[PDB]
Design a protein around this ligand. Structure first.
Ligand code: ZN
Length: 71
Protein backbone atom coordinates (compact mmCIF):
# COMPACT_ATOMS: atom_id res chain seq x y z
CA UNK A 1 0.00 0.00 0.00
CA UNK A 2 1.05 3.47 -0.93
CA UNK A 3 -0.24 6.86 0.10
CA UNK A 4 -1.78 7.60 -3.24
CA UNK A 5 -4.67 9.97 -3.55
CA UNK A 6 -7.99 8.17 -3.45
CA UNK A 7 -6.06 4.86 -3.24
CA UNK A 8 -5.29 4.93 -6.98
CA UNK A 9 -3.28 1.96 -8.21
CA UNK A 10 0.18 3.01 -9.31
CA UNK A 11 0.73 0.71 -12.28
CA UNK A 12 -0.49 1.46 -15.75
CA UNK A 13 -3.49 -0.86 -15.83
CA UNK A 14 -5.41 0.53 -18.84
CA UNK A 15 -5.83 -1.87 -21.74
CA UNK A 16 -4.27 0.47 -24.29
CA UNK A 17 -1.08 0.97 -22.18
CA UNK A 18 -1.49 3.86 -19.72
CA UNK A 19 -3.06 4.34 -16.27
CA UNK A 20 -6.83 4.62 -15.60
CA UNK A 21 -6.25 8.33 -14.87
CA UNK A 22 -4.22 8.60 -18.11
CA UNK A 23 -6.88 6.65 -20.04
CA UNK A 24 -8.01 9.64 -22.24
CA UNK A 25 -4.37 9.95 -23.41
CA UNK A 26 -4.48 6.26 -24.42
CA UNK A 27 -6.83 7.25 -27.27
CA UNK A 28 -4.10 9.52 -28.65
CA UNK A 29 -1.69 7.58 -30.83
CA UNK A 30 1.34 9.72 -29.97
CA UNK A 31 2.71 7.04 -27.63
CA UNK A 32 2.43 4.40 -30.38
CA UNK A 33 4.41 6.58 -32.79
CA UNK A 34 8.18 6.64 -32.38
CA UNK A 35 8.41 2.85 -32.19
CA UNK A 36 10.66 1.05 -34.63
CA UNK A 37 8.25 -1.81 -35.42
CA UNK A 38 4.48 -1.66 -35.20
CA UNK A 39 4.35 -5.45 -35.44
CA UNK A 40 6.42 -5.87 -32.27
CA UNK A 41 4.40 -7.28 -29.41
CA UNK A 42 3.93 -4.88 -26.53
CA UNK A 43 0.98 -3.82 -24.33
CA UNK A 44 -0.13 -1.31 -26.99
CA UNK A 45 -2.23 -2.59 -29.88
CA UNK A 46 -0.15 -3.25 -33.05
CA UNK A 47 -2.97 -2.21 -35.38
CA UNK A 48 -3.17 1.56 -35.43
CA UNK A 49 -6.53 3.27 -35.56
CA UNK A 50 -5.36 6.39 -37.40
CA UNK A 51 -3.39 4.50 -40.02
CA UNK A 52 -6.21 2.88 -41.92
CA UNK A 53 -4.58 0.92 -44.70
CA UNK A 54 -1.24 2.71 -44.31
CA UNK A 55 0.11 -0.05 -42.06
CA UNK A 56 -1.11 -2.70 -44.50
CA UNK A 57 -0.49 -5.37 -41.85
CA UNK A 58 -4.05 -6.37 -41.07
CA UNK A 59 -5.35 -6.58 -44.63
CA UNK A 60 -2.78 -9.24 -45.83
CA UNK A 61 -2.85 -10.90 -42.36
CA UNK A 62 0.83 -11.82 -42.63
CA UNK A 63 2.71 -11.91 -39.37
CA UNK A 64 6.42 -12.52 -39.44
CA UNK A 65 7.91 -13.33 -36.08
CA UNK A 66 11.49 -12.95 -37.29
CA UNK A 67 10.80 -9.40 -38.52
CA UNK A 68 9.28 -8.22 -35.24
CA UNK A 69 11.73 -10.02 -32.97
CA UNK A 70 14.72 -7.78 -33.37
CA UNK A 71 15.79 -9.01 -29.90
ZN1 ZN B 1 -7.22 3.90 -22.80
Amino acid sequence: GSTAMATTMEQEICAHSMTFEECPKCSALQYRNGFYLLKYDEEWYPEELLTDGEDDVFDPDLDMEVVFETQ
